[PDB]
Amino acid sequence: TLSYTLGQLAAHVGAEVRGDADLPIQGLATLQEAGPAQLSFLANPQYRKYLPESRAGAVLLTAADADGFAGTALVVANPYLAYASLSHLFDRKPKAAAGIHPTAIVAADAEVDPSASVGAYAVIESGARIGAGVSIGAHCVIGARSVIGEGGWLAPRVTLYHDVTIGARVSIQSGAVIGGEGFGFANEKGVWQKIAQIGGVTIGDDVEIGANTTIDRGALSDTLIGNGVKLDNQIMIAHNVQIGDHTAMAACVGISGSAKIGRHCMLAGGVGLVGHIEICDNVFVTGMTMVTRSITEPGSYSSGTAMQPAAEWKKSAARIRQLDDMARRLQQLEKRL
Amino acid sequence: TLSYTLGQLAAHVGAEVRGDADLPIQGLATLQEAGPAQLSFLANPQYRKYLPESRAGAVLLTAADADGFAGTALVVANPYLAYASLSHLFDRKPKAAAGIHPTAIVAADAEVDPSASVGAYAVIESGARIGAGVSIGAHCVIGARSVIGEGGWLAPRVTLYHDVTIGARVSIQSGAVIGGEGFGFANEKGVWQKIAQIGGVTIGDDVEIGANTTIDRGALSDTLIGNGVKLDNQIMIAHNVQIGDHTAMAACVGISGSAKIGRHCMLAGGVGLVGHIEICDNVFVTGMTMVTRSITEPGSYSSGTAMQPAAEWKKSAARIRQLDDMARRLQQLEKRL
Amino acid sequence: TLSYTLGQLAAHVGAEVRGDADLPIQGLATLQEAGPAQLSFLANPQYRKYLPESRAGAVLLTAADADGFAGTALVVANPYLAYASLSHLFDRKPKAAAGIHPTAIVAADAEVDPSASVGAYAVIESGARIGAGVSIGAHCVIGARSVIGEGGWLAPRVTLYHDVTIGARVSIQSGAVIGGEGFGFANEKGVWQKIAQIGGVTIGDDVEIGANTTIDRGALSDTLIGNGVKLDNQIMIAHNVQIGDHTAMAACVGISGSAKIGRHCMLAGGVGLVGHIEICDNVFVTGMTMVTRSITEPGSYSSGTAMQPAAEWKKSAARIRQLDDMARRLQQLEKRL
Ligand SMILES: O=C(O)CCC(=O)c1cccc2ccccc12
Ligand SMILES: O=C(O)CCC(=O)c1cccc2ccccc12
Ligand SMILES: O=C(O)CCC(=O)c1cccc2ccccc12
Ligand SMILES: [Mg+2]
């Protein structure tokens, strides 16, 4: 097991020990799943009720929660952010150290920093470029002239096409496909005719791309993902979308061709965006919303209906089908009075 | 071709022959696509009209349907369940018999039952564990310390991360990713900060996982899939979801972080569940529903609207935008009478 | 760089030069991103305002737009379709010329036209059949007795199962899975029992299949994709669906078991179709629509609600919950007058 003292861990997030710093810790855990060997935290004002009964060894707490506290504490401004920081010290994910696999193919035109690792059966086409301390997983395919900046981590079975440019510290889960040819077809008298896709992709720094997520290449200009953009799993980004820095998109979100999302935007799960619209900075879209027109006011937007028992849903739908009569009924009365 | 007598096939589901058991059969087919060489069935009271004209050789039938029947029958309590049983005898899917491929990599720390098969270019990291009569397809990646119980069938290009524990008789279609790092980020003054994902996955026995489906690893505790849980394709299960045994989820369903589904639940296609809610046992959610709050009453739940021609949809939406006036109009009249 | 004269390019789409045909061109570009080295076009009557200020070298234009035009033009009936045609001459996607990779496995029972290419670590099972001038990418898996007609292009990490038959000039982006076993289970007293999937797939000619798209094999008959059918990314086609020739489906669309779509149909993004319904020819379904019943009238169909600010959405939902009172209120008044 990986284990550390409260002192080593307090050091990492600059906390104050309020028991004994000598106490070993072997992993992290929620308030009411935590053992004596484990560090927890209170982030939610709500779970304030559940703190005393925790068998946690130690607890990341604001000075306020820590005050009159039965146990040993680690005191910090933001427990959750400290929790977030500490989480990496307990990550048991393997880290295949530097060098290529004999199996992995690499074109003679491909630069590949010595500090980087390429896993089994990998492939790397002509003009590729693997920046420093990058980690490329097994069965990954990098396409021609595609670029992963330093600190990148690509899980196995990730595919880049030709002409995909990525900043530093990229994180890409398995199954991801970047630079694919999206729907582009013209209608010649009711037959679809292939518009070839001759843009590429450009992705800034510190970007997460979740598993089985697809990002289409541009039609002419590049598909643009800004810096610190966090994309969950099963996401679809069409050709020529632009995403503002620090925008977060939850799972199963689909953005149509040429849509532009400003900065610090949050799209909840299974949001769709029609093509050729613009979303201004600081927009929250609630889950399974269909965004149909550009957004200029920052704030929160929804579509959908209240969940009901199916029977009540049928009565609602029917009450909705009779709105016309009700407005006819209501105009006949408007006359006589 | 694979072929069998009505007797061999009656044996397998303990049916009564009501023609001659000597009659060869070469495959199965629907009532009104069936040839003389083929066994059909009546499961639907509805298709009772379509039975006489069937050119089926033989028909799995309840005693009731079989009575006064022109053709040769196989009599059973449940034709459809008998149909289901017989279906496997006509499955032409290859079965790469035991042993590893020279190509496949296996770490020295990995146990791999002799009875199991590992296909071309496979990969198996340190501390892996391939139970007995498991079948691992080509380009599969098993991650470190991950465990497939006996009878497992993993199609090609399936990915397990580190620390994925799976019961017996697992069936996983291609493209599936289990143990991926889902969206977990804290907001440091408008920048997303990686919460590392240090849970794993635990999956019980007799579980189906469809193609390109993703199951996230836990943040701290494991992601939990109970026994006999049937997940269609393109599904997304976020970190720390719990699924009750015998729950079925149709394609394109997305379950957010920490949601709990009880047992014998049915989620129709493209249902979404917001995070941190609980669904009690025996809930049916109709297709493309957004479930926003916990469910305590067993039964059937919906959201969405009646499909209309687009023009009528526009008149509905407009009739809905004027509900406020209609309640103002209706309060002015409420006064004077 | 690839470069061509206006004359060579006018030749390809039979246009009339209305400056000098000697002028080299190095790529294509939108009206107001175009440099002097680049050919643009006016397809949209809307962007007619943006033509004069374009730094485009040359512009594909209808005679009408070209008339009194400051720059050098290429004159054609349909600029956009000419644009579509020309686009392929600037496609920088690599093209791994004929022959197999030493790495690639091929069964002795597999025919593989000499004109075709199979990339690194590919796999091709018994009874396969790679028609002429087909291109199979790295890590592709073709399953047993599956057939790609001539002119096919399969990106890397594409998976075919056993018994998948495909016409000519197929285009399949990465991550695609064709012939997977979809949800098929019977309920034996609340336990799901595997119905084996013993149909295959049949796909006509000139078909696009986008990335991470899944197409299920048939239960008994084949899954059917007609000719010139264009499927975007992240799409799910259940067992035994039928798609009419020239039907287009945008990204994240999900079609349930046994649904039939006629010809020249357009499904916008994230449309769902319930199983066992029929859609007649020439139907447009707007984005994120749930189609619940068969469609017989050609035209345009919708479900969903108008996007609102979340607050207004809450007032709408509440105004909708009080429709019953409003119809009670409206019946009490209907009495007294
Ligand atoms: O659920 C939360 O409350 C936050 C994350 C989120 O938006 C999400 C993730 C996955 C599937 C979903 C389905 C419906 C609504 C939301 C989601
Ligand atoms: O369609 C049925 O009636 C049963 C299976 C099912 O729920 C389904 C599967 C795939 C896509 C869907 C889209 C909308 C609604 C349902 C589905
Ligand atoms: O958006 C257009 O206007 C045309 C293409 C399209 O229908 C689309 C593509 C991807 C995601 C979507 C989400 C919602 C609505 C439409 C889409
Ligand atoms: Mg979806």
Q: Mind spelling out the 3-state secondary structure of C62-123? A: CHHHHCCCCCEEEECCCHHHHHHHHHHHHCCCCCCCCEECCCCCCCCCCEECCCCEECCCCE
Burial class (CB in 10 A: 0-12, 13-18, 19+), C70: exposed
A184-188 own/partner pairs: CB under 8 Å, 24+ apart: A184/A219, A184/A239, A185/C84, A185/C208, A185/C230, A185/C248, A186/C78, A186/C80, A186/C81, A186/C83, A186/C84, A188/C81
Phi-psi region of C234 (alpha: psi -120 to 50; beta: other; left: phi over 0): left
CB atoms within 10 A of CB C157: 30
d(CA B238, CA A251) in angstroms, rounded, equals 8
Nearest to B308 by CA among C121, C123, C304: C304
B13-17 own/partner pairs: CB under 8 Å, 24+ apart: B13/B60, B13/B74, B13/B76, B13/B82, B13/B85, B13/B86, B14/B76, B15/B60, B15/B74, B15/B75, B15/B76, B15/B82, B16/B74, B16/B75, B17/B72, B17/B73, B17/B74
The three-point CA angle B198-B113-B117 to 5° equals: 95
Nearest to C154 by CA among C166, C142, C172, C180: C172
Whether C215 and C233 have beta carbons less than 8 Å apart is answered as: no
Which residues in B lie closer than 8 A to residue A307 (C-beta atoms)? Answer: 289-293, 301-303
The answer for A 185-244 residues in CB contact with B (under 8 A) is: 208, 210-212, 228, 230, 232-234
Cβ-proximal residues to A35 (8 Å cutoff; 6+ apart), any chain: A29, A55, A56, A57
Structure-determination technique: X-ray
Burial class (CB in 10 A: 0-12, 13-18, 19+), B137: buried
Pick from C159, C320, C333: which is nearest to B157 by CB?
C159
Whether B157 and B137 have beta carbons less than 8 Å apart is answered as: yes
Helices first, then strands: H and E counts in chain C:
5, 39
Tokens of C114: 């000499």
Rounded distance from Cα C282 to ligand 2 centre (Å): 22
d(CA A185, CA C210) in angstroms, rounded, equals 13
Distances (CA, A) of B238 to A94, B21, B214, B241, C280: 22, 51, 8, 6, 38
- Residue B201's identity, in one-letter code, is V
Q: Is the CB of B26 inside 8 Å of chain C's CB atoms?
A: no
Q: Which atom of ligand 1 is nearest to the CA of B272?
A: 13
Question: Helix, strand or coil for residue C49?
Answer: helix
Residue positions counted in chain C: 337
Nearest to B317 by CA among A324, A315, C289, C291: A324
What resolution, expressed in A, was reported for this entry? 2.6
d(CA A221, CA A199) in angstroms, rounded, equals 5
C-alpha dihedral (A298, A302, A303, A304), degrees to nearest 10: 170
Phi-psi region of A256 (alpha: psi -120 to 50; beta: other; left: phi over 0): beta
Residue A136 has phi, psi (to 5 degrees) of -105, 120
Pick from C92, C307, C310: which is nearest to A290 by CB?
C307
Nearest CA in chain B to A288: B290
Strand partners, C27: C38
Tell how strand A283-285 and strand B254-255 pair up. Answer: unpaired
Phi-psi region of A240 (alpha: psi -120 to 50; beta: other; left: phi over 0): left
Q: Which of C157, C158, C253 to mutate to test the interface with A (most CBs of A within 10 A)?
A: C157
Question: Helix, strand or coil for residue C151?
Answer: coil
Distances (CA, A) of A310 to A307, B227, B264, B284, B299: 9, 28, 18, 9, 8
Pick from A91, A246, A287: which is nearest to B272 by CB?
A287
Whether C244 and C298 have beta carbons less than 8 Å apart is answered as: no
- Residue A173's identity, in one-letter code, is Q
Q: Do B185 and A174 touch (CB under 8 A)?
A: no
d(CA B250, CA C185) in angstroms, rounded, equals 11
d(CA A204, CA A166) in angstroms, rounded, equals 6
CA B324 and chain centroid, separation: 44
A123-128 own/partner pairs: CB under 8 Å, 24+ apart: A123/C120, A123/C121, A123/C138, A123/C139, A123/C156, A125/A162, A125/C94, A126/C94
Strand partners, B225: B203, B243
Strand partners, B164: B201
Nearest to A137 by CA among A158, A168, A113: A158
d(CA A234, CA A217) in angstroms, rounded, equals 17
Q: Is the CB of C87 inside 8 Å of chain B's CB atoms?
A: no
The three-point CA angle C97-C101-C106 to 5° equals: 115
Rounded distance from Cα A240 to ligand 4 centre (Å): 20
Which numbered ligand comes closest to the C-alpha of C249? 3
d(CA B238, CA B240) in angstroms, rounded, equals 7
Nearest to C256 by CA among B291, B213, B268, B228: B268
Q: Is C272 in the pocket of ligand 2 (CB under 6 A)?
A: yes
Q: Is C258 in the pocket of ligand 2 (CB under 6 A)?
A: no
What is the longest distance spanned by two Cα atoms in chain C? 91
Tell how strand B58-61 and strand B141-142 pair up. Answer: unpaired
Helix (H) or strand (E) holding C27: strand C27-28
CA A278 and chain centroid, separation: 20
Which residues' Cβ are closer than 6 Å to ligand 1?
A 250-251, 268-270, 287-288; B 238, 254, 256, 272-275, 290
| Chains in contact with B via at least 3 Cβ–Cβ pairs below 8 Å | A, C
Whether B235 and B210 have beta carbons less than 8 Å apart is answered as: yes
Whether A5 and A26 have beta carbons less than 8 Å apart is answered as: no
Which domains are present in chain B? 1-99 (3.40.1390.10), 100-337 (2.160.10.10)
Question: Helix, strand or coil for residue C263?
Answer: coil
Rounded distance from Cα A3 to ligand 3 centre (Å): 49
Q: Is the CB of A326 inside 8 Å of chain C's CB atoms?
A: yes
SS (H, E, C) chain A: CCCEEHHHHHHHCCCEECCCCCCEECEECCCCCCCCCEEEECCCCHHHHHCCCCCCCEEEECHHHHCCCCCEEEECCCHHHHHHHHHHHHCCCCCCCCEECCCCCCCCCCEECCCCEECCCCEECCCCEECCCCEECCCCEECCCCEECCCCEECCCCEECCCEEECCCCEECCCCEEEECCCCEEEECCEEEECCCCCCEEECCCCEECCCCEEECCCCCCEEECCCCEECCCCEECCCCEECCCCEECCCCEECCCCEECCCCEECCCCEECCCCEECCCEEECCCCEECCCECCCEEEECCCCCEEHHHHHHHHHHHHCHHHHHHHHHHHHHCC
Tokens of C184: 């098929």
Q: Is the CB of C317 inside 8 Å of chain B's CB atoms?
A: no
CA B125 and chain centroid, separation: 28
Whether B237 and B255 have beta carbons less than 8 Å apart is answered as: yes
End-to-end CA distance of chain A: 83
Dihedral sign for Cα A36, A38, A41, A47, please: negative
d(CA B243, CA A223) in angstroms, rounded, equals 37
Whether A17 and A28 have beta carbons less than 8 Å apart is answered as: no
Strand partners, C75: C16, C61
Q: Do B163 and A288 touch (CB under 8 A)?
A: no
Token pair 């697809």: residue: A214
Which residues in C lie closer than 8 A to residue B103 (C-beta atoms)? Answer: 105
Question: Helix, strand or coil for residue C247?
Answer: coil
Dihedral sign for Cα A227, A229, A234, A237, please: negative
CA neighbours within 13 Å on the CB side: how many for C49? 2
Is A239 marked active-site? yes
Which numbered ligand comes closest to the C-alpha of A185? 3
What is the longest distance spanned by two Cα atoms in chain B? 91
Whether B56 and B38 have beta carbons less than 8 Å apart is answered as: yes
Pick from B121, B301, B319: which is nearest to A307 by CB?
B301
Tokens of B326: 């209609």
Q: Do A182 and C324 touch (CB under 8 A)?
A: no
Tokens of B105: 């990599």
Rounded distance from Cα C252 to ligand 4 centre (Å): 5
Tokens of C94: 């690599």
Tell how strand B290-291 and strand B272-273 pair up. Answer: parallel
Q: Which residues of C are catalytic?
A: 239
d(CA A42, CA A60) in angstroms, rounded, equals 7
**Rg, chain B, Cα only:** 26
Distances (CA, A) of C131 to C104, C118, C135: 17, 12, 10
Nearest to A249 by CA among A208, A200, A291, A206: A208
Whether C246 and C227 have beta carbons less than 8 Å apart is answered as: yes
Strands (DSSP E) along C173-295, which ranges? 177-180, 185-188, 191-194, 201-203, 208-209, 214-216, 223-225, 230-231, 236-237, 242-243, 248-249, 254-255, 260-261, 266-267, 272-273, 278-279, 283-285, 290-291
Q: Do C157 and A157 touch (CB under 8 A)?
A: yes
CB atoms within 10 A of CB B280: 17
Whether C295 and C312 have beta carbons less than 8 Å apart is answered as: no
Tokens of A85: 């920081």
What is the longest distance spanned by two Cα atoms in chain A? 91
Residue C108 has phi, psi (to 5 degrees) of -65, -25
C101-105 own/partner pairs: CB under 8 Å, 24+ apart: C101/C138, C103/A105, C104/C136, C105/B103, C105/B120
Rounded to the nearest 10 degrees, the angle between the axes of helix B323-335 and helix C310-321 is 50
d(CA A183, CA A275) in angstroms, rounded, equals 12
Mutate to test the pocket of ligand 3, among A240, A249, A274 (most ligand atoms within 8 A of CB): A274
d(CA A83, CA A85) in angstroms, rounded, equals 5
b/e A92-117 (16+ beta carbons within 10 angstroms → b): ebeeeeeebbebbbbeeebebeeebb
Pick from A30, A212, A311: which is nearest to B220 by CB?
A30
Cβ-proximal residues to A332 (8 Å cutoff; 6+ apart), any chain: none
d(CA B130, CA B170) in angstroms, rounded, equals 12
Token pair 């701290």: residue: B220
Token pair 């916990």: residue: B294
d(CA B257, CA A37) in angstroms, rounded, equals 26
Q: Do A214 and C234 touch (CB under 8 A)?
A: yes
CA neighbours within 13 Å on the CB side: how many for C43? 11
Strand partners, A302: C308
Strands, sheet with C177-180, edge to edge from the N-terminal-most edge strand: C123-124, C141-142, C159-160, C177-180, C214-216, C236-237, C254-255, C272-273, C290-291
Whether B18 and B6 have beta carbons less than 8 Å apart is answered as: no
Nearest to B320 by CA among C332, A313, A316, A331: A316
Helix (H) or strand (E) holding C329: helix C323-335
The three-point CA angle B279-B281-B284 to 5° equals: 75
| Chains in contact with C via at least 3 Cβ–Cβ pairs below 8 Å | A, B
Question: Helix, strand or coil for residue C328?
Answer: helix
d(CA B115, CA B131) in angstroms, rounded, equals 8
Helix (H) or strand (E) holding C25: strand C24-25
**Rg, chain A, Cα only:** 26
Q: Do C183 and B230 touch (CB under 8 A)?
A: yes
**Eight-state DSSP code of residue C219:** S
d(CA C80, CA C267) in angstroms, rounded, equals 22
Q: Do A185 and C208 touch (CB under 8 A)?
A: yes
Whether C22 and C7 have beta carbons less than 8 Å apart is answered as: yes
CB atoms within 10 A of CB A31: 21
Helix (H) or strand (E) holding C16: strand C16-17
Q: Which of B33, B90, B213, B232 to mutate to test the interface with C (most CBs of C within 10 A)?
A: B232
Q: Is C184 in the pocket of ligand 2 (CB under 6 A)?
A: no
d(CA B207, CA C93) in angstroms, rounded, equals 40
**Eight-state DSSP code of residue C295:** B
SS (H, E, C) chain B: CCCEEHHHHHHHCCCEECCCCCCEECEECCCCCCCCCEEEECCCCHHHHHCCCCCCCEEEECHHHHCCCCCEEEECCCHHHHHHHHHHHHCCCCCCCCEECCCCCCCCCCEECCCCEECCCCEECCCCEECCCCEECCCCEECCCCEECCCCEECCCCEECCCEEECCCCEECCCCEEEECCCCEEEECCEEEECCCCCCEEECCCCEECCCCEEECCCCCCEEECCCCEECCCCEECCCCEECCCCEECCCCEECCCCEECCCCEECCCCEECCCCEECCCEEECCCCEECCCECCCEEEECCCCCEEHHHHHHHHHHHHCHHHHHHHHHHHHHCC
Nearest CA in chain A to B161: A93
b/e C140-152 (16+ beta carbons within 10 angstroms → b): bbbbbbbbbbbbb
Whether A220 and C29 have beta carbons less than 8 Å apart is answered as: yes
Whether A286 and B272 have beta carbons less than 8 Å apart is answered as: no
